[PDB]
């Protein structure tokens, strides 16, 4: 079970004062949308540390993309789940090119050799299935050509989460780049859709992440057999899955931003994880 929190002194939440009035902070299925100002990280850290939470962070670094590992891992050390147990899983075709990065206590890295479009979904579902169940409580699946710039912590953890694509968070659903051909398993028509989620940042409990990756892998195989490739590949399938299986938290675009392409809008109080 879960033990009591200790006594804590913090500002009283005020019912007649919203945290943020400029953005939606809860979905219509009552999942929090995680923005700066919506969470007290001290309360959340207590809750998750009292469960001895271990977070797995997966990245694929193939061919030239191994060059991104050093900055990715060094900045993860500064910003990602600091204080909690972290297990990095680096999937690569070049185990010797993985940089030797100094890790904080309670943090470990495993290099897993591989070797295409389906490799990520396949590797996460039913190649590393048993290992992940034994080793971590949550999985966070991200792209490697990125850097952490600010806190990314236990506020994201939940059974299943997606992240709002920074190019589409203000867009009408008709403008979302979902797969629009009915012949694809990823098809979403013009009158459906909550959000446009990123392929590059999703996660959840190991069980829910394995369900998602298994479903996507199966859908991608069906499309391949039918001679169709979804417009945005695994991201299109991720969007179909999260439409039909609503995430239990949604991360705001603070969690995956491209400052060169999109600047630093007022609505973003922090830029936490960004394109290089």
From Swiss-Prot:
Cofactor entry? Mn(2+)
How is it placed in the membrane, per its record? Single-pass type II membrane protein
Q: In which tissues is it expressed?
A: Expressed at high levels in testis. Also expressed in pancreas, uterus and lung and salivary gland.
Q: State where Mn(2+) binds.
A: 143, 145
Q: Which residues form the active site?
A: 235
Q: Which pathway does the database say it acts in?
A: Protein modification; protein glycosylation
Indicate where this protein resides in the cell: Golgi apparatus, Golgi stack membrane; Secreted
Q: What is the effect of changing residue 155 to D?
A: In allele B106
Alphabetical keyword list: Blood group antigen, Glycoprotein, Glycosyltransferase, Golgi apparatus, Manganese, Membrane, Metal-binding, Secreted, Signal-anchor, Transferase, Transmembrane, Transmembrane helix
One term under GO cellular component: vesicle
Documented effect of changing residue 115 to G: In allele Aw08 and allele Bw08
Gene Ontology biological process: carbohydrate metabolic process; lipid glycosylation; protein glycosylation
* Binding site residues for UDP-N-acetyl-alpha-D-galactosamine: 60-62, 65, 143-145
- Effect noted on mutating residue 130 to W: In allele Aw07
- How many and how are cofactors bound here? Binds 1 Mn(2+) ion per subunit.
Residue positions annotated to bind an alpha-L-fucosyl-(1->2)-beta-D-galactosyl derivative are 165, 177, 235, 258
Modifications after synthesis and translation: The soluble form derives from the membrane form by proteolytic processing.
Please give the catalytic activity noted in the UniProt record.
an alpha-L-fucosyl-(1->2)-beta-D-galactosyl derivative + UDP-N-acetyl-alpha-D-galactosamine = an N-acetyl-alpha-D-galactosaminyl-(1->3)-[alpha-L-fucosyl-(1->2)]-beta-D-galactosyl derivative + UDP + H(+); an alpha-L-fucosyl-(1->2)-beta-D-galactosyl derivative + UDP-alpha-D-galactose = an alpha-D-galactosyl-(1->3)-[alpha-L-fucosyl-(1->2)]-beta-D-galactosyl derivative + UDP + H(+)
EC number(s) reported in the record: 2.4.1.40, 2.4.1.37
Purpose of the protein = This protein is the basis of the ABO blood group system. The histo-blood group ABO involves three carbohydrate antigens: A, B, and H. A, B, and AB individuals express a glycosyltransferase activity that converts the H antigen to the A antigen (by addition of UDP-GalNAc) or to the B antigen (by addition of UDP-Gal), whereas O individuals lack such activity.
What is the protein's given name?
Histo-blood group ABO system transferase
List the lineage, top down: Eukaryota, Metazoa, Chordata, Craniata, Vertebrata
């Amino acid at each position: 079970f879960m033990v009591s929190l200790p006594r804590m002194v913090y500002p009283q939440p005020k019912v007649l004062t919203p945290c943020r009035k400029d953005v939606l902070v809860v979905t219509p299925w009552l999942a929090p949308i995680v923005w700066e100002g919506t969470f007290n990280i001290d309360i959340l850290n207590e809750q998750f540390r009292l469960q001895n939470t271990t977070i797995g962070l997966t990245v694929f670094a193939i061919k030239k993309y191994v060059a991104f590992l050093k900055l990715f891992l060094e900045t993860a050390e500064k910003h990602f789940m600091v204080g909690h147990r972290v297990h990095y899983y680096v999937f690569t075709d070049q185990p010797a090119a993985v940089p030797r990065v100094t890790l904080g206590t309670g943090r470990q890295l495993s290099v897993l050799e591989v070797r295409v479009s389906m490799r990520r979904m396949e590797m996460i579902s039913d190649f590393c299935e048993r290992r992940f169940l034994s080793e971590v409580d949550y999985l966070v699946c991200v792209d490697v050509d990125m850097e952490f710039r600010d806190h990314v912590g236990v506020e994201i953890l939940t059974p299943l989460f997606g992240t709002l694509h920074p190019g589409f968070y203000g867009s009408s659903r008709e403008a979302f780049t979902y797969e629009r051909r009915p012949q694809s398993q990823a098809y979403i028509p013009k009158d459906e859709g909550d959000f446009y989620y990123l392929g590059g940042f999703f996660g959840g409990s190991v069980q829910e992440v394995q369900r998602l990756t298994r479903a996507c892998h199966q859908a991608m195989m069906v499309d391949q057999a039918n001679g169709i490739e979804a417009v945005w590949h695994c991201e299109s399938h991720l969007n179909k899955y999260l439409l039909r299986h609503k995430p239990t938290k949604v991360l705001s675009p603070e969690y995956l931003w491209d400052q060169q392409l999109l600047g630093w809008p007022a609505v973003l109080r922090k830029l936490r994880f960004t394109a290089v």
